C-alpha cells in the first residue's frame, strides 16, 4: 500500500492513529517485516495525485 511520510509509524503493532485505526491494522502477535521507501519521484504529480 501507499501512505504519506508522517504516518509511517502508524503501520506498526501497538500504535494508534487514523491510518492505523481505520485503513490498515496490524495484529498484536505479528511475525514479519515491513519495507517502506520514498516514492516522490514516482507517484507525485505537479497538479496532484
Amino acid at each position: 500500500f501507499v501512505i504519506r511520510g508522517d504516518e509511517v509509524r502508524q503501520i506498526a503493532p501497538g500504535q494508534t492513529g487514523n491510518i492505523a485505526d481505520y485503513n490498515y491494522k496490524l495484529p498484536d502477535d505479528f511475525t514479519g517485516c515491513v519495507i517502506a521507501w520514498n516514492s516522490n519521484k514516482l507517484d507525485s504529480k505537479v497538479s496532484g495525485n
Partner: antibody
Amino acid sequence: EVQLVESGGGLVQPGRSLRLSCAASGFRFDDYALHWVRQAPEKGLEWVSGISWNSNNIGYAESVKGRFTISRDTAKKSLYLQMNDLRAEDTALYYCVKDRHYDSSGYFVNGFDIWGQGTLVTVSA
Amino acid sequence: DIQLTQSPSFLSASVGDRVTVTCRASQGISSYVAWYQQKAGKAPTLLIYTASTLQSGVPSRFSGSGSGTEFTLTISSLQPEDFATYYCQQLHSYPVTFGQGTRLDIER
C-alpha cells in the same frame, strides 16, 4: 511480444464521421496510459489525445476540442478514437501509442515506449 | 502551452564526428524532456528520457543532458543507422507539443 495495431482509417467526405481503433497485444492493458498522435505529410508530428488507466484523466489539444472523443474498454483491450465533423486538417497518418506509467503527464518519468504502424485518414471531396 | 524550438533545422555530418542538437523552451519545464528518433518511413522510437537516462537496448553513443530551459541531445560517435530525424517534447503541463525536428544528413 508488445505490439499495437491501428485500424479504421480510410477516405472520408467532410460532414461525415468515422471511428478509429487501436488494438492492444502483448502487454497488460488495464494499467498503462494510451495517447493518440497524428502525422500529416512533411510537417513533423502532432499530439491528438491521451487517456488514463481509470478513465479519469482525458485531454485533447485545443485545435481538436469539441469534435473528437477518446474512449477505452478493458474487455476487448482496445482504444477508441471517435471522429465528428471531419475537416481538411484531419488528413494525416494517425499513430496510437502506449505510455508506461498509467497516466498522461505530470510524473517525473513518462514516455511513449511503443509506436504503432498507423492508419491513413484522408478527408476530401 | 510551452513552445519548443530546435536550433538546428538540418545538419550534414559524417561518420565518427559529434552531433549536438538544442531544444529550447519558453518557460521552465524542469527536466521533463525526452527525445525520439524516426526511421525513414517508420514509427519514431524513444532514445533517452528525463533528458539523462537511457531506456533500454540503446547504443551507448547516445547521450544528453539538460538544466532549466536548455536541453541538448548529443551523439558521441556516428553509425550508418544514426541518420534520421530527432524530436524533443515537453512534459511539464497536460497539453503536449512535439518539436519541428532536426534532420541529419549524409556527407557527399
